[PDB]
Design a protein around this ligand. Structure first.
Ligand SMILES: CCCCCCCCCCCCCCCCCC(=O)OC[C@H](COP(=O)([O-])OCC(O)COP(=O)([O-])OC[C@@H](COC(=O)CCCCCCCCCCCCCCCCC)OC(=O)CCCCCCCCCCCCCCCCC)OC(=O)CCCCCCCCCCCCCCCCC
Ligand SMILES: CCCCCCCCCCCCCCCCC[C@@H](O)O[C@H](CO[C@H](O)CCCCCCCCCCCCCCC)COP(=O)(O)OCC[N+](C)(C)C
Ligand SMILES: CCCCCCCCCCCCCCCCC[C@@H](O)O[C@H](CO[C@H](O)CCCCCCCCCCCCCCC)COP(=O)(O)OCC[N+](C)(C)C
Ligand SMILES: CCCCCCCCCCCCCCCCC[C@@H](O)O[C@H](CO[C@H](O)CCCCCCCCCCCCCCC)COP(=O)(O)OCC[N+](C)(C)C
Ligand SMILES: CCCCCCCCCCCCCCCCC[C@@H](O)O[C@H](CO[C@H](O)CCCCCCCCCCCCCCC)COP(=O)(O)OCC[N+](C)(C)C
Ligand SMILES: CCCCCCCC/C=C\CCCCCCCC(=O)O[C@H](COC(=O)CCCCCCC/C=C/CCCCCCCC)COP(=O)(O)OCCN
Ligand SMILES: Nc1ncnc2c1ncn2[C@@H]1O[C@H](COP(=O)(O)OP(=O)(O)O)[C@@H](O)[C@H]1O
Lengths: 121, 49, 459, 69, 104, 98, 56, 347, 320
């Protein structure tokens, strides 16, 4: 709908070139830590389902779970940030190019505006 | 003990363990290198450093 | 405020990695430490809130509620660790996990700074409570109690979500500060009438309002003792917190939309208070008393005066403590005789004197004996109502007399008279039970020593 | 107690000012985004809601065995 | 079988005072029981209750109640010294307020 | 719209109504499906012939191909139904009622 | 003696460590809201010759 | 049936769906639907019995009628505008025919009758495939032509689907019919937001597919097709029943679980338009789905039902084949709400 | 590679390992017949694998360590109590019958799995196809009710239809007075209480139902008590049979693949034994179920999977 057709968009890129002009998410980003936590929970559930010692059955596969979730989450966060940046860019440009639709109104102080008073009693 | 041979060997499957650890280290190293590359590229584009 | 949130999320793995015979000790010790830490939120400012971060904040209304929650968790652990003795270690850890998750959700709920996050956690509190009731309840009515509780909540809470997203789209924000500073009057329109109803009805159901209260006796009677404690002490006050947070945008429609609810709260106050006079079940009696007290709090919030708000905060805290203590006291007898009928075990003052004095002190606090905080809250609400209309004093005084009547009736029935002859399994009161009663009742008096800490932001 | 556990009132005061500024900016941005979306969907002149039209590179501009195409 | 299930009989209640005449009602094991009592009493009555109440009783005046009293004393002294009405019914200066020019 | 177009669309509507009403036999419903295919083929051919869409001329042919596939599929299923009941009556296909 | 009791009671440090981590995280969070530090109309004051920030 | 032939049939079904997804020509989308149905018919009949034959016949008849209506709509659109490209669909009569054909293919009310019976008549693997993968192609086509969706017709069918799914699920004891009715209700929720935002449709579809995959793999792990046969699982796999209960609560739409995220977003989207009454009705109707999910949870996890003596033998044997992605699907089906903003990577 | 679709797509076919001597054989007879010794002799002469008759604790021998478990944890029934009080009101008779049927089904699955994996033939001392003679004996003597018979028939109908009947059915015919004399000479006090009507009912069920039913799909070689001792004669009689009437000659590679997938995965084999039919003899309450299951989990090598139990000497757990 809103963003599917946008000029100069490569179909299946998942990460346009202009996206590199944005700050990469830090490796300690709390969303990345939550993705790692999701990977850890998946590993523990895997241990419990196969009837293995939940905390300490397979450390290598739990590490693979956590690293896979973190790996996917990094690029997911990059793409999400890029799409939000695109939304903001397009909105600002549209505001700038259509001034008559977004006029700056007169600034009034509360000493001039008359608000009706509703007593509580 | 166990009358059957317990298909999952009493010693770890060293091939599977090695490959799993290897892909974990490879993914971590790739992620670190990629993060460095985007940090450098972003700094270069925006005139920061 | 993460200095309180993180230690509970650390209560989780500590419980799950403690050995089989030390889960209760570790949980109790560290929950008490967390309550001591949370006690630092009582140093409130006089003009604005304590805006810790973009997502969490605290004022003088949410700080006493947070302290009550953190204090209630150890009491729940101590009261639970008796009837779960034969349970396996895994399911005991699961029960403790349910309690910890409930406390964490409540802690985030009382301090969420925007309305959608508050809604998300206010609804998230439903899952641990439902699991507790329907998994560790005793009778076969626990399933129906859970169904009534869940659906009564959700039926009133979904329109609140619709109204909240509507408000955010129309005004642009749902942060409490921006909502308060940019507040505008609501016009007298049918659309505004239904927006008011959608914003109010969820918290009405959570109180519960008289007429929508039929879930509360079932849920509080069928639940285990920890479930009953958390339901009566804290989960009933979510409605009051939400009401006193969301009424800032409902003016001036409230002035004429509160007319039905006020009536339902006033006359209902009498009706439920009369039901306690003819209750043959102790837990149902306590639940109906909770309903009447919450009706008084609803009146306080609806008339919307500073004295009414102070009284509502004081009454919420006082009722939480008193109802928790009453439920624990009833549970002691239940574990003695395995029956909830009030007239089964009689004359217990002869056999359990110290428990008898605990019963007396709890009943005296329940009927609002001065200078307890129960009386302070009730009296402030009564004065606010008298300012609202001088005819309210008739209903309030009727309620006071009936409250004294059923409180002392329950005390006399359970404690006085002569013992039942055939009941010979009444063992002496344990140190755990007496300590639980003392830890319920000492904060009440220590709080009436310094009441300004529970009087709310209008103080 | 005040020195060991707490700070001054200025810290909370100015943190509140910063928080209020951030939330007010967010509210104004949300309202502006809603208005921009309404305008773009109504008109179709912006980068958004650009529904596809047939590519003109597909047309064959060659003699067609008949002069009038 | 004239029954419906192969179900265990309902067991009878285990009195904690039987094996442990001084039992505190915390656990079956006497050592863990005594230590549960000890930790509950020490961290509830000793640490949280008394020390927390003492901490609450000495909280600094962040509510500004003595400050307001001193300000009111100074204002009252000032306004009585110059024969002022001691409080104005206008919370804000009317000069800084622009009423609508006419309501007719 | 010429009158022949109207007749072809009416034929399609009649075939669709005939399929949506079941009497007893599954073969009759398969026949109604084949009739819908035939009407669609004639409609497409007339439209493509009137507007001289040269590359679209293979389109009806492909249509016919998948028509057969559907027919084949239905016939296969019908055999199985018969093998379970001895008749192709749709009233026997009521096991999934409960 | 240390090894067994440590492996038994290492769970008693999770909550104190959690509280310390929460304090550190609160400090990090409120170090991001300094856009008005020493800029308020009520608390605008001249910096001392030795200090650099009114509050941390 | 041969493993190579089964692989080829599954690959043909997937290739038909992909062909529908990657095509810009109406004839190619139709061919993709045809290939999908042709390869799908035998997969429903992998385990041969009269019930499977019944389900395959009913599915074939429904999908063939839908294909006829699809092709007729395409041809009418071609007649009124010589365009083969999938676009705005210049004709309204053809648009109504297309909407009805796609609704019949998806199972939206009142074309829902075939879904519970086809789901009950086939195995759990075929039911998983039918209730997850078969919903992609019609929804993709509907997403591409949302500009010409008649809001009245689509919203009526969506509200009808939600109501019918909620009511029909209340009467069901078999698990496959319960899954079918939940599928109908979720399809209604998915298509209700279609005229306003297709990103919300895709988000709801992904969350629904994750929850449905988790539910079906749990029901395959514990070989249960009825309520009472699932009542026995606690005595052999308590962990499986606990995970199943949490998944059921997530599908019920309770926060802070993943199943809350789609409907929440959907409600917000319709509130960006005026659309106030409809989201309220949809929430109060999803209450019914939550009710029968909770009934299943009471039977399976929150109470202990009586067992049998032979179960002891099952205590001595483990699971021979373990389904991969089950832990990941459970986690994604429950603990994903905090990552809600990532939906921006869907448009 | 554990057998599955992948092992079938490339390579492994089971018709290339069937060497005409597979000949799944079951020996049958009444109580205290020489069928066990005959089965052992046949197995060692023909080079097959002998399967001792499945008792109460058969499944315990193939899981964990082969040692049997407590009766409270496996079985929950005893044959001695059946011989003492066959009409007891606790439902021991039919509980024993159904547990024995499940054990026989498991043993048949194990024998079929061995045959289809190695091609070596097997000899069985009874089968799921003849377990019903005891059920009919109990029903005619009033030991069990008609509802128990219906439950047995339902489970048998949904279970035994998925397997192939044995190639050769061997019956040892020893008349009732002779087996009574053998029981008297045995020395087990509990077997001494078997009434003659019970053995008569067993024999009637065998001769009137089992043998005619297995005639149309198997090779039936009846014998007598005297002919059983000379097992070489029996072996040379088996070696000159024509296995042409059953469903075995009509088995392709795909049907064999389906059967081999079914015979492994013992949970799938035992699936329909625990159907939710609430017979008071075999239904167990929630409290007893929970207690006994918790007791079972506490067993030394039964808490985790067969490779992850530290307390039975499994090491390197954290790396598995
Ligand atoms: C928001 C804040 C954070 C919260 C996030 C959400 C919660 C946490 C994440 C959840 C997922 C995590 C793990 C999931 C799989 C675990 C399943 C399990 O059984 O666990 C067994 C296992 C113990 O079993 P075991 O040792 O293997 O041997 C015993 C046998 O297994 C004995 O086995 P068994 O067969 O006898 O067990 C039978 C039992 C087994 O049944 C279960 O165990 C229930 C399984 C839980 C369902 C999880 C589904 C997905 C998660 C959704 C959570 C929703 C949260 C939202 C709120 C709604 C709540 C529903 O079933 C029953 O008896 C029937 C009871 C019916 C009750 C119904 C309620 C069930 C649903 C409850 C869900 C709530 C979340 C629970 C989280 C913790 C649970 C372990 O538990 C653990 O040991 C894991 C605990 C966590 C490990 C952390 C340790 C790490 C190191 C500690 C230090 C930390 C950092 C150090 C650095 C600091 C510096 C020093
Ligand atoms: C419960 C969570 C469910 C999630 C489902 C599985 C999660 C893993 C997803 C697998 C990632 C790989 C998919 C694609 C990677 C490379 C291909 C790339 O080119 O795809 C492009 C972009 O990739 C995908 O489009 C986005 C996939 C991202 C999925 C994650 C969002 C999940 C929703 C938010 C819930 C939070 C979950 C947190 C993580 C578990 C497509 O561009 P475009 O041709 O233009 O799209 C056409 C269709 N549109 C425009 C209508 C959308
Ligand atoms: C079990 C307990 C549950 C809780 C109960 C909550 C009760 C909710 C009721 C809320 C009261 C106010 C609702 C309507 C506001 C006005 C009252 C009504 O009399 O309207 C009059 C108008 O006359 C008629 O009454 C109009 C309404 C007629 C239809 C309403 C009757 C509904 C019957 C009650 C149903 C019971 C409630 C429970 C439903 C499940 C007022 O005249 P007017 O000054 O011009 O209009 C003022 C409002 N305007 C300005 C916006 C237009
Ligand atoms: C001279 C005194 C006479 C009377 C004494 C009165 C008794 C008062 C003591 C009671 C204390 C109540 C607990 C409240 C703690 C407040 C926690 C928090 O609010 O303060 C933290 C301050 O950190 C403190 O160090 C907290 C330490 C308190 C820990 C309490 C643990 C006590 C438990 C003892 C149990 C016994 C253990 C042995 C087991 C047998 C904040 O950290 P931070 O944001 O960075 O600093 C901001 C303020 N600064 C910048 C000005 C410094
Ligand atoms: C068994 C034997 C019984 C009989 C024997 C009794 C023994 C003697 C007792 C009799 C003496 C009565 C006490 C008389 C009052 C003196 C104490 C008073 O001075 O302290 C009050 C203060 O009391 C405390 O404020 C009470 C603390 C409140 C409770 C703390 C909470 C504890 C945590 C438990 C959780 C509770 C959760 C519920 C929500 C909060 C006064 O408040 P304030 O004038 O200002 O402080 C004075 C100090 N100043 C001047 C520097 C300001
Ligand atoms: C335990 C049971 C509790 C039951 C509580 C449920 C009922 C709560 C009250 C009704 C909530 C519905 C409100 C809908 C959401 C509010 C949003 C809003 O107010 O926006 C209005 C929209 O207002 C509405 O559309 C409201 C329509 C209501 C339809 C739903 C009917 C539900 C039942 C109605 C009667 C019952 C209500 C009270 C019952 C109390 C419980 C006994 C303005 O929108 P616009 O269209 O843009 O108009 C301005 C520009 N012209
Ligand atoms: N389905 C059954 N029901 C009751 N009892 C059975 C059943 N199957 C075997 N038994 C008992 O198992 C006992 C030993 O079996 P059997 O083969 O006859 O003795 P032996 O091994 O010495 O030849 C017998 O007493 C028989 O009654």
């Amino acid at each position: 709908t809103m963003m599917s057709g946008r000029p100069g968009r490569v179909p299946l890129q998942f990460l346009p070139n202009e996206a590199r002009s944005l700050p990469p998410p830090k490796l300690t980003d709390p969303r990345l830590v939550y993705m790692g936590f999701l990977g850890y929970c998946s590993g523990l559930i895997d241990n419990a389902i196969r009837r293995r010692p939940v905390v300490s059955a397979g450390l290598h596969r739990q590490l693979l779970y956590v690293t896979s979730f973190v790996f996917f989450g990094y690029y997911l966060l990059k793409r999400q940030d890029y799409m939000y940046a695109l939304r903001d860019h397009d909105m600002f440009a549209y505001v700038k190019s259509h001034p008559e639709d977004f006029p700056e109104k007169d600034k009034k102080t509360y000493g001039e505006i008359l608000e009706e008073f509703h007593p509580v009693r | 003990k166990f009358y059957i041979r317990e298909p999952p060997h009493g010693s770890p499957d060293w091939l599977k363990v090695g490959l799993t650890l290897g892909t974990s280290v490879f993914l971590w190293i790739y992620l670190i290198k990629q993060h460095k590359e985007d940090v450098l590229e972003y700094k270069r584009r925006n005139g920061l450093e | 405020m993460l200095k309180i949130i993180i230690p509970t999320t650390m209560l989780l793995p500590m419980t799950w990695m403690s050995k089989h015979n030390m889960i209760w000790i570790n949980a109790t010790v560290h929950s008490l430490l967390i309550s001591l830490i949370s006690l630092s939120l009582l140093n409130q400012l006089g003009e604005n809130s304590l805006n810790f971060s973009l997502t969490f904040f605290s004022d003088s209304l949410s700080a006493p509620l947070l302290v009550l929650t953190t204090w209630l968790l150890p009491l729940m652990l101590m009261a639970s660790q008796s009837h779960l003795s034969k349970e396996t270690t895994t399911r005991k850890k699961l029960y403790i996990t349910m309690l910890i998750l409930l406390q964490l959700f409540l802690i985030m709920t009382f301090t969420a700074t925007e309305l959608i996050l508050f809604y998300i956690l206010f609804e998230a509190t439903l899952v641990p409570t439902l699991i507790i009731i329907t998994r560790w309840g005793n009778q076969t009515e626990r399933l129906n109690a859970g169904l009534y509780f869940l659906f009564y909540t959700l039926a009133g809470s979904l329109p609140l979500l619709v109204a909240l997203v509507y408000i955010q789209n129309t005004t642009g924000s749902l942060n409490f500060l921006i909502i308060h500073y940019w507040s505008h009057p609501l016009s007298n329109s049918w659309s505004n009438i239904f927006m008011w109803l959608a914003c109010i009805m969820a918290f009405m159901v959570k109180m519960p309002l008289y007429g929508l209260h039929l879930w509360l006796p079932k849920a509080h009677v069928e639940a285990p003792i920890a479930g009953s404690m958390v339901l009566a002490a804290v989960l009933l006050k979510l409605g009051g917190y939400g009401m006193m947070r969301i009424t800032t945008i409902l003016n001036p429609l409230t002035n004429y939309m509160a007319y039905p609810f006020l009536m339902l709260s006033m006359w209902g106050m009498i009706m439920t208070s009369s039901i306690c006079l003819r209750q043959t079940d102790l837990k149902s009696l306590i639940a109906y008393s909770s309903v009447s007290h919450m009706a008084l709090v609803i009146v306080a919030i609806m008339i919307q005066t500073p004295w009414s708000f102070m009284g509502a905060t004081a009454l919420m805290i006082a009722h939480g403590l008193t109802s928790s203590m009453l439920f624990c006291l009833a549970n002691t007898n239940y574990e003695r005789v395995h029956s909830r009928t009030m007239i089964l075990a009689r004359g217990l003052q002869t056999l359990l004197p110290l428990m008898a004095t605990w019963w007396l002190v709890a009943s005296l606090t329940n009927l609002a004996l001065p200078p307890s905080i129960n009386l302070i809250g009730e009296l402030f609400i009564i004065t606010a109502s008298f300012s609202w209309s001088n005819i309210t004093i008739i209903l309030m005084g009727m309620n006071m007399m009936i409250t004294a009547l059923y409180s002392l009736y329950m005390l006399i029935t359970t404690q006085r008279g002569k013992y039942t002859h055939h009941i010979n399994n009444i063992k002496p009161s344990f140190t755990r039970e007496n300590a639980l009663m003392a830890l319920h009742i000492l904060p009440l008096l220590l709080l009436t020593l310094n009441p300004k800490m529970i009087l709310g932001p209008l103080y | 107690i005040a020195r060991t556990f707490y700070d001054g009132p200025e810290k909370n005061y100015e943190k509140t000012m910063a928080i209020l500024q951030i939330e007010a900016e967010k509210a104004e941005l949300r309202l502006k985004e809603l208005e921009v979306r309404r305008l773009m969907r109504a008109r179709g002149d912006g980068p958004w809601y650009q529904y596809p039209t047939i590519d003109k590179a597909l047309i064959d501009h060659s003699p067609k065995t008949t002069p009038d195409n | 079988p004239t029954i419906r299930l192969q179900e265990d009989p309902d067991p009878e209640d285990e009195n904690l005072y039987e094996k442990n005449p001084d039992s505190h009602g915390y656990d079956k094991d006497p050592i863990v029981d005594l230590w549960n009592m000890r930790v509950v009493f020490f961290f509830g009555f000793s640490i949280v209750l008394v020390l927390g109440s003492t901490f609450v009783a000495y909280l600094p005046d962040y509510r500004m109640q003595e400050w307001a009293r001193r300000e009111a004393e100074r204002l009252v002294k000032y306004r009585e010294a110059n024969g002022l009405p001691l409080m104005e019914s206008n919370c804000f200066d009317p000069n800084k307020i622009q009423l609508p020019e006419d309501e007719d | 719209m010429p009158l022949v177009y109207m007749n072809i669309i009416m034929a399609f509507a009649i075939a669709l109504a005939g399929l949506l009403m079941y009497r007893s036999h599954l073969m009759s419903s398969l026949l109604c499906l084949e009739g819908m295919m035939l009407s669609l083929f004639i409609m497409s051919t007339l439209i493509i012939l009137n507007t001289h869409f040269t590359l679209a001329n293979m389109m009806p042919i492909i249509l016919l191909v998948f028509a057969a596939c559907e027919a084949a599929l239905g016939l296969s299923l019908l055999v199985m139904v018969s093998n379970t009941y001895g008749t192709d009556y749709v009233q026997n296909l009521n096991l999934l009622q409960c | 003696n240390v090894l067994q009791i440590v492996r038994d009671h290492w769970v008693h440090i999770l909550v104190p460590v959690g509280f310390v981590f929460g304090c550190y995280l609160d400090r990090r969070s409120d170090e991001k809201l300094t856009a008005f530090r020493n800029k308020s109309l009520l608390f605008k004051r001249e910096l001392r010759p030795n200090e650099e920030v009114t509050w941390k | 049936m041969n493993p190579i032939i089964y692989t080829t049939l599954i690959m043909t079904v997937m290739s038909g769906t992909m062909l529908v997804m990657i095509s810009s020509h109406w004839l190619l989308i139709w061919i993709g639907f045809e290939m999908n149905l042709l390869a799908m018919i035998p997969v429903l009949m992998k385990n041969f019995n009269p019930r499977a034959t019944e389900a395959a016949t009913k599915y074939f008849l429904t999908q063939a009628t839908a294909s006829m209506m699809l092709m007729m709509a395409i041809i009418i659109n071609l007649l009124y505008s010589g365009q083969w490209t999938i676009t705005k669909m210049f004709n309204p009569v053809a648009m109504t025919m297309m909407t009805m054909a796609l609704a019949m293919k998806l199972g939206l009310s009142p074309f829902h009758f075939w879904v519970p019976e086809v789901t009950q008549g086939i195995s759990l693997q075929a039911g998983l495939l039918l209730l997850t993968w078969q919903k992609l192609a019609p929804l993709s086509v509907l997403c591409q032509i949302s500009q010409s969706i008649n809001p009245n017709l689509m919203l009526t069918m969506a509200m009808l689907s939600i109501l019918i799914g909620g009511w029909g699920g209340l009467n069901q004891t078999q698990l496959r019919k319960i899954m079918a009715y939940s599928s109908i209700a979720h399809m209604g929720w998915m298509t209700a937001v279609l005229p306003y935002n297709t990103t919300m449709t895709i988000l709801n579809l992904l969350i629904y597919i994750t929850m449905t995959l988790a539910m079906f793999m749990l029901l395959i792990h514990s070989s249960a097709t009825t309520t009472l046969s699932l009542s026995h699982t606690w005595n052999k796999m308590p962990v499986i029943t606990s995970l199943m209960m949490v998944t059921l609560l997530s599908m019920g739409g309770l926060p802070p679980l993943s199943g809350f995220m789609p409907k929440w977003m959907i409600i917000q989207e319709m509130t960006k338009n005026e659309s106030i009454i409809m989201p309220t009705l949809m929430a109060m109707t999803a209450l019914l789905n939550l009710y029968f999910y909770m009934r299943l949870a009471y039977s399976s996890s929150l109470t202990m039902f009586p067992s049998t003596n032979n179960m002891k033998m099952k205590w001595q044997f483990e699971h021979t084949k373990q389904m991969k992605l089950l832990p990941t699907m459970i986690v994604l089906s429950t603990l994903v709400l905090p990552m809600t903003p990532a939906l921006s990577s869907l448009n | 590679l554990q057998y599955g679709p992948l092992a079938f797509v490339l390579g492994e076919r089971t018709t290339r390992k069937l060497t005409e001597t597979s000949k799944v054989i079951t020996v049958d007879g009444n109580i205290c017949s020489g069928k066990g010794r005959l089965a052992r002799e046949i197995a060692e002469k023909l080079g097959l694998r002998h399967f001792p008759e499945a008792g109460i604790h058969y499944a315990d021998s193939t899981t964990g360590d082969g040692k049997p478990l407590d009766v409270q944890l496996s079985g929950n029934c005893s044959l001695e109590k059946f011989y003492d009080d066959p009409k007891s009101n606790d439902g021991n008779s039919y509980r024993l019958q159904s547990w024995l049927y499940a054990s026989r089904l498991l043993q048949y699955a194990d024998a079929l799995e061995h045959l289809l994996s190695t091609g070596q033939g097997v000899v069985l001392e009874r089968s799921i196809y003849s377990d019903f003679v005891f059920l009919e004996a109990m029903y005619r003597q009033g030991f069990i009710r008609k509802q128990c018979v219906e439950h047995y028939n339902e489970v048998k109908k949904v279970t035994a239809c998925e397997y192939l009947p044995p190639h050769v059915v061997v019956y040892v015919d020893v008349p009732v007075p002779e087996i009574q004399s053998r029981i008297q000479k045995k020395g087990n006090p509990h077997e001494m209480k078997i009434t003659a009507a019970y053995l008569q009912d067993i024999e009637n069920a065998y001769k009137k139902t089992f043998l005619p039913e297995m005639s149309e799909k198997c090779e039936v070689l009846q014998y007598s008590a005297r002919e059983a001792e000379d097992a070489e004669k029996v072996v040379e009689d088996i070696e000159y049979l024509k296995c042409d009437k059953g469903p075995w000659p009509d088995q392709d590679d795909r049907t064999f693949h389906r059967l081999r997938m079914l015979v492994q995965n013992k949970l799938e084999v035992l699936n329909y034994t625990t159907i939710p039919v609430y017979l008071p003899e075999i239904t167990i309450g929630a409290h007893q179920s929970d207690r006994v299951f918790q007791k079972f989990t506490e067993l030394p090598g039964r808490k985790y999977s067969p490779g992850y139990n530290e307390d039975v000497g499994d090491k390197w757990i954290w790396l598995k």
